[PDB]
Amino acid sequence: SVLNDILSRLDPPEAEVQIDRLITGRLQSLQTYVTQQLIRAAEIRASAN
Amino acid sequence: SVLNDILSRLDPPEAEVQIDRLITGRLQSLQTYVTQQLIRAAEIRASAN
Amino acid sequence: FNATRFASVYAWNRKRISNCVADYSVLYNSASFSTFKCYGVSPTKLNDLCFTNVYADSFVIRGDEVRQIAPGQTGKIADYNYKLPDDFTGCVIAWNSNNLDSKVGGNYNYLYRLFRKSNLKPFERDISTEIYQAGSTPCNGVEGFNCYFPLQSYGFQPTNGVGYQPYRVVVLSFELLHAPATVCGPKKSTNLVKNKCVNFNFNGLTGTGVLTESNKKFLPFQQFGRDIADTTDAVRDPQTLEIL
Amino acid sequence: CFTNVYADSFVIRGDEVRQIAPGQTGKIADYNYKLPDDFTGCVIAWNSN
Amino acid sequence: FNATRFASVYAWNRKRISNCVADYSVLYNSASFSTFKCYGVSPTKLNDL
Amino acid sequence: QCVNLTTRTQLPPAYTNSFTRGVYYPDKVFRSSVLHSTQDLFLPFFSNVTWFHAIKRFDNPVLPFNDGVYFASTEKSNIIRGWIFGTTLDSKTQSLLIVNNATNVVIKVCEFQFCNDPFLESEFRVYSSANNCTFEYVSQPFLNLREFVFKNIDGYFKIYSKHTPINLVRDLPQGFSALEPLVDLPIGINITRFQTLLALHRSGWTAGAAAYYVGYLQPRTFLLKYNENGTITDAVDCAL
Numbered sequence: 001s002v003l004n005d006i007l008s009r010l011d012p013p014e015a016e017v018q019i020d021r022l023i024t025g026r027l028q029s030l031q032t033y034v035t036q037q038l039i040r041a042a043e044i045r046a047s048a049n
Numbered sequence: 050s051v052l053n054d055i056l057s058r059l060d061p062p063e064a065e066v067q068i069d070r071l072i073t074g075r076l077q078s079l080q081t082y083v084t085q086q087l088i089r090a091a092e093i094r095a096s097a098n
Numbered sequence: 099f100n101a102t103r104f105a106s107v108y109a110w111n112r113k114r115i116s117n118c119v120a121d122y123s124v125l126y127n128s129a130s131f132s133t134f135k136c137y138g139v140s141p142t143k144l145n146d147l148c149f150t151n152v153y154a155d156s157f158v159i160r161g162d163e164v165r166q167i168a169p170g171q172t173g174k175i176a177d178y179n180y181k182l183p184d185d186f187t188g189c190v191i192a193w194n195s196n197n198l199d200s201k202v203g204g205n206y207n208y209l210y211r212l213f214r215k216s217n218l219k220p221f222e223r224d225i226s227t228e229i230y231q232a233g234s235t236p237c238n239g240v241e242g243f244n245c246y247f248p249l250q251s252y253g254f255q256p257t258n259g260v261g262y263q264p265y266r267v268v269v270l271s272f273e274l275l276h277a278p279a280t281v282c283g284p285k286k287s288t289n290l291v292k293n294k295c296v297n298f299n300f301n302g303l304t305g306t307g308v309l310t311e312s313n314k315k316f317l318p319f320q321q322f323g324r325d326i327a328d329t330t331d332a333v334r335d336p337q338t339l340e341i342l
Numbered sequence: 343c344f345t346n347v348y349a350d351s352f353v354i355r356g357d358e359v360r361q362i363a364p365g366q367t368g369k370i371a372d373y374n375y376k377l378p379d380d381f382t383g384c385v386i387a388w389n390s391n
Numbered sequence: 392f393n394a395t396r397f398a399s400v401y402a403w404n405r406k407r408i409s410n411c412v413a414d415y416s417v418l419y420n421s422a423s424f425s426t427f428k429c430y431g432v433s434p435t436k437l438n439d440l
Numbered sequence: 441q442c443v444n445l446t447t448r449t450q451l452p453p454a455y456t457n458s459f460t461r462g463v464y465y466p467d468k469v470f471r472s473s474v475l476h477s478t479q480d481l482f483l484p485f486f487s488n489v490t491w492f493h494a495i496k497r498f499d500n501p502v503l504p505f506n507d508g509v510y511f512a513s514t515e516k517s518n519i520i521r522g523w524i525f526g527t528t529l530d531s532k533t534q535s536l537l538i539v540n541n542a543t544n545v546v547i548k549v550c551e552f553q554f555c556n557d558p559f560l561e562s563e564f565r566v567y568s569s570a571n572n573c574t575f576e577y578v579s580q581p582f583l584n585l586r587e588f589v590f591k592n593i594d595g596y597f598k599i600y601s602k603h604t605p606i607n608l609v610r611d612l613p614q615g616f617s618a619l620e621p622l623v624d625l626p627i628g629i630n631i632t633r634f635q636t637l638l639a640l641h642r643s644g645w646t647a648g649a650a651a652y653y654v655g656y657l658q659p660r661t662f663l664l665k666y667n668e669n670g671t672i673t674d675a676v677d678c679a680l
């Protein structure tokens with residue numbers, strides 16, 4: 001999970017693949033969090049109206 | 050980010066690992082767009098009703 | 099490739115090639131085993147495309163470090179004599195040269211540096227042969243207490259095993275950007291068609307579409323135009339220098 | 343378990359090993375022995391000094 | 392090194408030292424050393440690896 | 441003659457402000473009616489620059505070549521001729537020289553025995569020896585505002601220039617003018633310091649005041665605007 005060890009404990013040229021897995025994984029998780037809030041915010045606005 | 054260059058610069062079993070990232074990256078963008086549109090359409094229907 | 103003398107690792111000779119035709123068919127005229135492990139491009143008949151500039155570098159590497167010349171690699175000479183960037187795109191050609199460099203009299207003209215106290219950046223040339231100092235006491239031109247010569251000869255002899263045999267190598271580096279290409283493969287031109295849905299190939303810019311006249315106020319240094327979407331919208335013919 | 347096995351044997355020296363390769367097209371390969379890109383199987387080269 | 396009684400030619404004290412920390416700066420004090428040749432590793436850097 | 445003369449008295453150079461000068465086309469791609477954001481070496485907006493006055497107090501000192509240099513000179517009769525570069529500025533090491541004549545420009549890169557105050561009157565009173573000139577190229581002369589941008593990246597020396605005809609005796613004027621690329625010179629060696637030279641009719645003897653400003657480039661992000669035509673009409677300095 002620690003990306004620091006990937007740079008050092010593992011070679012630079014292949015580490016870009018592992019970093020891509022971490023970056024793509026986290027970026028998608030961030031995307032999922034937003035989508036739920038958009039749905040939740042719609043539910044709240046119906047209550048506020 | 051150009052498909053023609055990738056095909057015209059790499060052997061077939063090499064290009065596959067390169068096109069897949071592009072296709073999945075672009076498939077994610079289209080799926081993201083549709084999800085936002087579905088959310089917006091529902092809000093509009095509330096205002097239309 | 100078949101130069102009479104090849105320079106040492108610490109001082110490699112860099113050669114510039116431009117404004118000609120690069121036929122890559124002559125690589126199979128030299129010795130049988132010529133490693134052709136390529137980065138970024140596939141040499142399997144897919145080297146027939148236009149590049150911008152080409153740099154050629156040559157030296158002689160022992161088998162204990164034959165694979166040190168690779169992006170993101172560290173070792174005896176990788177970080178001290180020749181550094182390759184991680185994003186390097188190109189090819190490395192290596193072949194045995196025991197029949198030439200190794201001699202009965204003795205080959206001591208080849209040296210490699212060990213003492214620098216600092217790493218090497220990608221494509222760095224270190225030519226200084228001053229005595230390295232590893233202590234507070236200055237060397238003043240004598241070895242001993244933390245004063246060792248960085249330049250160590252290779253001692254290539256034919257008797258030594260294949261592992262220690264000298265191999266002559268060469269590394270090719272290109273770049274493929276928006277600048278006009280100067281070196282191109284053996285491709286034959288063809289006439290220009292307008293107002294017709296045809297394929298096209300402009301120095302590797304393969305695509306499909308309809309080519310027509312363009313009113314764009316192209317500037318003399320400008321190669322091709324672009325649109326809002328960041329896509330090739332207009333192009334300039336490499337031969338008749340016409341904007342389409 | 344396999345449906346069938348097709349064996350092809352001929353005398354080829356080591357100089358032709360790289361040109362007669364799975365999926366790697368060559369000038370001699372196009373005229374003598376051409377292999378599909380998706381060839382499945384193995385190739386065994388035996389010493390005959 | 393600072394042993395008055397040294398070993399014989401054919402009977403050398405093959406001493407193995409383990410579970411310890413090794414310092415090579417302290418032994419370099421004497422200026423009477425004549426030959427100092429290293430095979431496979433650098434004369435410097437020995438502390439790190 | 442280019443012997444040791446100390447006629448000029450050294451004084452602290454003046455400083456002036458560069459408002460919106462030093463913008464160049466960063467690529468050969470052609471765009472119109474878009475705003476494009478690019479990252480490249482640029483002269484920061486509202487960055488003050490050194491002011492030099494030549495003449496009989498000729499101000500031709502050595503100046504460091506710090507990652508690209510902006511140059512300009514509002515003088516008539518094109519008194520200035522060319523520029524020189526290098527590390528030790530002598531025959532011991534390789535150096536680059538660019539000069540100009542009545543009807544062309546001469547660019548060479550080889551070891552020269554540069555004197556203390558090389559200047560062009562004079563014809564070849566700037567050096568005395570030549571080791572081996574790997575590159576040479578002659579083209580048309582560059583010939584009252586004249587601006588020049590020098591860039592040496594990856595060993596490709598690039599020059600952008602623009603000749604704007606104005607008639608005034610004031611400082612750098614407010615206004616916008618993108619610099620267009622002129623040449624690309626593959627040399628492959630580095631440069632730390634640089635110096636200019638001018639056409640001086642040394643010994644009566646013809647003379648006149650000359651001025652030239654010097655500004656250094658920094659890595660910045662700019663937002664250049666292209667109109668419906670091919671030209672760059674305005675830009676934004678992001679980190680101002």
Ligand SMILES: *[C@@H]1O[C@H](CO)[C@@H](O[C@@H]2O[C@H](CO)[C@@H](O)[C@H](O)[C@H]2NC(C)=O)[C@H](O)[C@H]1NC(C)=O
Nearest residue numbers: 225505506507526527528533629630631632633
């Ligand atoms: C151009 O390269 C030369 C190397 O031949 C540099 O010269 C040395 O550079 C180091 C690093 O700054 C200095 O510590 C030395 O004092 C320099 N020696 C001399 C004789 O100048 C030179 O600095 C490089 N130029 C630039 C602009 O980086």
Ligand SMILES: *[C@@H]1O[C@H](CO)[C@@H](O[C@@H]2O[C@H](CO)[C@@H](O)[C@H](O)[C@H]2NC(C)=O)[C@H](O)[C@H]1NC(C)=O
Nearest residue numbers: 313314315316472666667668669670671672673
């Ligand atoms: C864009 O470029 C065109 C050149 O084709 C300009 O058109 C000319 O512009 C000049 C001065 O700008 C006028 O004097 C001419 O009469 C124009 N001729 C034609 C046929 O249009 C155009 O003006 C430029 N646009 C801008 C904003 O400068």
Ligand SMILES: *[C@@H]1O[C@H](CO)[C@@H](O)[C@H](O)[C@H]1NC(C)=O
Nearest residue numbers: 099100124125126127128129
């Ligand atoms: C050897 O050098 C000659 C010089 O023209 C060249 O024609 C030939 O192809 C070279 N042979 C090689 C590189 O195997």
Ligand SMILES: *[C@@H]1O[C@H](CO)[C@@H](O)[C@H](O)[C@H]1NC(C)=O
Nearest residue numbers: 453454455456457487488489
């Ligand atoms: C130019 O700007 C600097 C930046 O602070 C400042 O010293 C001053 O405004 C100008 N320089 C001089 C020497 O006045």
Ligand SMILES: *[C@@H]1O[C@H](CO)[C@@H](O)[C@H](O)[C@H]1NC(C)=O
Nearest residue numbers: 541542543544546562563578
């Ligand atoms: C350039 O101008 C000089 C004047 O000093 C002249 O002598 C020379 O012939 C001209 N041409 C060249 C190529 O130097």
